[PDB]
């Protein structure tokens, strides 16, 4: 009954995220450009959650030995293939790269995110790279929260974050935004392609095994979900407040 409360709270916050007022407030091309310039940080940090879970639920070492759970390794390996290295009509690329292409298609600037990633490649911390390109404060909090899960969270928390805070909410969020912008497909075709590309038992089983059936740890997983959702809500709150101020 401790966990049922969290489960229901996650359902409610999911509906709130899927209908966040930011989405109905992106009315002009200018506003869509700003949206993408914030959103690209989440498109990018998403892959750190994926890779933390790939490390934990598959065997990425020499010598190899079979992962303990084949269903879990299958699901992660599927996500890696489709997200690090998707097949698109314009060739093989990460969803991150596809999103950058979509940004250029609409005329949004990719300079801040490319410089951030370039610094990370040269071994700056994510925190340092973010500050360096003057990322918006809400972007910093969001990405720092992702990174803290990835570097410091236990496997069951990363799973909660990922499933409840990302995989379970992205399709609904993307649908809300797509429905506003379908009418512009002819001028923004790659962003439509990107969004459309992203439009349960398995998740719970992975959490239970990572949690070892311990109800405290199951609570931790659910809580990591709620936390991730909160961080997403604060990102969109920040973007919306930015649009308001700079309209
Ligand atoms: Fe993706
Ligand atoms: Na672990």
Distance 155 CA to ligand 2 centre (A): 4
Instruction: Give me the residues near ligand 1 (ion), CB cutoff below 5 Å.
Output: 83, 95
Which residues contact residue 136 at a Cβ distance below 8 angstroms, ignoring those fewer than 6 apart?
Answer: 38, 238, 239, 242
According to the entry, how was the structure determined?
X-ray
- Name the burial class of residue 98, with classes exposed (0-12), middle (13-18) and buried (19+) by CB atoms within 10 angstroms of its CB: buried
> Distances from the Cα of 57 to the Cαs of 52, 54, 187, 207, in angstroms?
9, 5, 41, 11
3-state SS class at 126: helix
Classify residue 1 by its DSSP letter: -
Name the H helices within 23-110. Answer: 29-57, 70-84, 95-106
Establish how many alpha carbons lie within 13 A of residue 157's alpha carbon, considering only the half-sphere containing its beta carbon: 16
Got the DSSP string for 153-188? S-HHHHHHHHIIIIITTHHHHHHHHHHHHGGGTTTS
Residue 91 tokens, joined: 């060739």
- The tokens describing 192, both together, are 């439509």
Backbone dihedral region for residue 123 (phi beyond 0: left; psi -120 to 50: alpha; all else: beta): left
Please name the residues in contact with 59: beta carbons below 8 A apart, sequence gap of 6 or more.
65, 66, 67, 73
Cβ neighbours of residue 127 closer than 8 Å, sequence gap 6 or more: 140, 144, 147
Q: What is the DSSP string of 27-39?
A: -SHHHHHHHHHHH
Q: Which residues pair with 86 in a beta bridge?
A: 93
Residue recorded with tokens 């490649």: 121
Q: How far apart are CA 230 and CA 76, in angstroms?
A: 24
Closest listed ligand to the CA of 152: 2
Q: Is 55 left (phi over 0), alpha (psi -120 to 50) or beta?
A: alpha
DSSP 20: -
Q: How many Å apart are CA 146 and CA 106, to the nearest integer?
A: 27
Give the C-alpha distances (Å, rounded to integers) separating 93 from 29, 115, 122, 175, 178.
25, 19, 21, 22, 22
Distance, CA of 161 to CA of 157 (rounded, Å): 6
Closest-lying ligand to the alpha carbon of 193? Answer: 1
Q: In CATH, which of 1.10.10.60, 1.10.1060.10, 1.20.1440.230, 1.20.910.10 is domain 2-245?
A: 1.20.910.10
| Nearest ligand to residue 86 Cα | 1
Collect contacts of 15-21 with beta carbons under 8 A, ≥24 apart: 16/233, 17/169, 17/172, 17/173, 17/229, 17/232, 17/233, 17/236, 18/169, 18/172, 18/173, 18/175, 18/176, 19/176, 20/173, 20/176, 20/233, 20/236, 20/240, 21/240
Sequence-distant contacts of 55-63: CB under 8 A, at least 24 apart? 56/155, 56/158, 56/210, 57/155, 57/206
Chain centroid to CA 129: how far?
19
43 alpha carbon to ligand 1 midpoint, in Å? 7
Distance between CA atoms of residues 119 and 72, nearest Å: 33
Ordered by start, the domain boundaries in the chain are 2-245
* 4 vs 10: CA distance, rounded Å: 10
């Amino acid at each position: 009954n401790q966990l049922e409360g969290l489960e229901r709270k996650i359902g409610e916050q999911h509906e709130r995220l899927a209908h966040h007022p930011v989405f109905g407030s992106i009315r002009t091309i200018d506003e869509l450009r700003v949206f993408m310039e914030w959103h690209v940080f989440a498109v990018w940090d998403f892959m750190s959650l994926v890779k933390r879970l790939q490390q934990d639920l598959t065997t990425v070492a020499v010598p190899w030995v079979a992962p303990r759970n084949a269903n879990a390794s299958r699901l992660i390996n599927e996500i890696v293939l489709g997200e690090e290295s998707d097949e698109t009509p314009n060739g093989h690329m990460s969803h991150y790269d596809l999103y950058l292409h979509a940004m250029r298609d609409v005329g949004a600037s990719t300079s801040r995110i490319e410089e951030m990633v370039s610094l990370v490649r040269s071994g700056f911390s994510v925190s340092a790279a973010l500050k360096a390109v003057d990322a918006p404060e809400p972007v910093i909090r969001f990405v720092e929260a992702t990174m803290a899960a990835c570097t410091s969270g236990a496997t069951h928390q990363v799973l909660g974050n990922f499933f409840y805070g990302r995989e379970n909410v992205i399709p609904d969020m993307f649908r809300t935004l797509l429905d506003e912008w379908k009418i512009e497909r002819s001028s923004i075709p790659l962003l439509v392609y990107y969004l459309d590309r992203h439009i349960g038992p398995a998740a719970r089983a992975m959490i239970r095994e990572a949690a070892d059936g311990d109800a405290a740890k199951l609570e931790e997983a659910l809580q990591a979900g709620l936390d991730a959702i909160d961080e997403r809500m604060r990102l969109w709150d920040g973007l919306l407040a930015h649009l308001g101020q700079t309209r």
